[PDB]
């Protein structure tokens, strides 16, 4: 790489806060908070709302049951 043209870039820990799932990768975010890695050296941590281990599509988790059919809604509404 050439010198002085590329932005500052360094290893960070992306931390999915929902599942408290850490994984190390490079990025230019430069977040202040530091959390120790399995390796001794700490690196800045990036808080993550969602991730591959927390997304319903990735995990297959079904948040809500499928919509009832018309016959089923008729029956459950009218008690028959």
């Amino acid at each position: 790489m050439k010198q002085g043209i590329h932005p500052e870039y360094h290893q960070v820990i992306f931390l999915d806060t929902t599942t408290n799932f850490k994984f190390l990768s490079g990025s230019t975010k430069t977040s202040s908070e530091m959390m120790e890695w399995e390796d001794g050296k700490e690196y800045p941590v990036i808080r993550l709302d969602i991730s591959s281990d927390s997304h319903p599509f990735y995990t297959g988790r079904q948040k809500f049951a499928a919509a009832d059919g018309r016959v089923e809604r008729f029956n459950k509404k009218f008690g028959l």
């Binding site: 790489m1 043209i5 590329h6 932005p7 870039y9 992306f14 994984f23 190390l24 990768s25 490079g26 990025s27 230019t28 975010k29 990036i46 993550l48 709302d49 969602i50 991730s51 591959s52 927390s54 997304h55 599509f57 990735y58």
Partner: protein
């Protein structure tokens, strides 16, 4: 190099067993990733292209090449040589870091995400993914994004066929 280690260890073995490769050198690998942003409105406002270049640089980690019009087109009011795009080529460790980040941290941030097109293969083992908004990437703050614009991510692989490319990307972890 977590993704690279996964490729060396698990993906190599899985793919080689699945496709009966007589040698490891036949195992497909991701040759490069080219992230392109076509900014045609740079014709009307160069500051748009400047912002696009800055955002692409933040996303990728390296300065983008500014791509200029190859020919003039009257309808677009485009003159040959006018800068109308940005492009970054990623290889090696930066490529792998960007790929794992795109799979894990970035893609789920897509609004109403339901996986990526499984038919978006050129027919020769290369996959192009069209992201419709830059806000997906964790490195961009929506406050500083004057305009939202997409990107084309071309994963160029050594696979000869869409089937092998699909297997490689799925093992890496691409939704479909």
């Amino acid at each position: 190099n977590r993704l690279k280690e996964k490729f060396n260890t698990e993906v190599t073995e899985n793919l080689m067993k699945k496709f009966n490769y007589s040698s490891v050198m036949e195992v497909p690998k991701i040759d490069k990733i080219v992230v392109n942003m076509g900014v045609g409105d740079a014709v009307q406002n160069s500051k748009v292209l400047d912002n696009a270049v800055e955002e692409l640089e933040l996303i990728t980690g390296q300065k983008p090449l500014v791509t200029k019009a190859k020919k003039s087109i009257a309808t677009f009011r485009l003159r040959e040589g006018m800068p109308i795009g940005a492009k970054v080529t990623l290889r090696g460790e930066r490529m792998y870091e960007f790929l794992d980040k795109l799979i894990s941290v970035s893609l789920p941030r897509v609004r109403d995400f339901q996986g990526v097109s499984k038919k978006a293969f050129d027919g020769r083992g290369n996959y192009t993914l069209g992201v419709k908004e830059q806000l997906i990437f964790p490195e961009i703050d929506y406050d500083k994004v004057s305009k939202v614009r997409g990107m084309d991510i071309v994963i160029v692989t050594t696979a000869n066929t869409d089937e092998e490319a699909r297997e490689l990307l799925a093992n890496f972890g691409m939704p479909f």
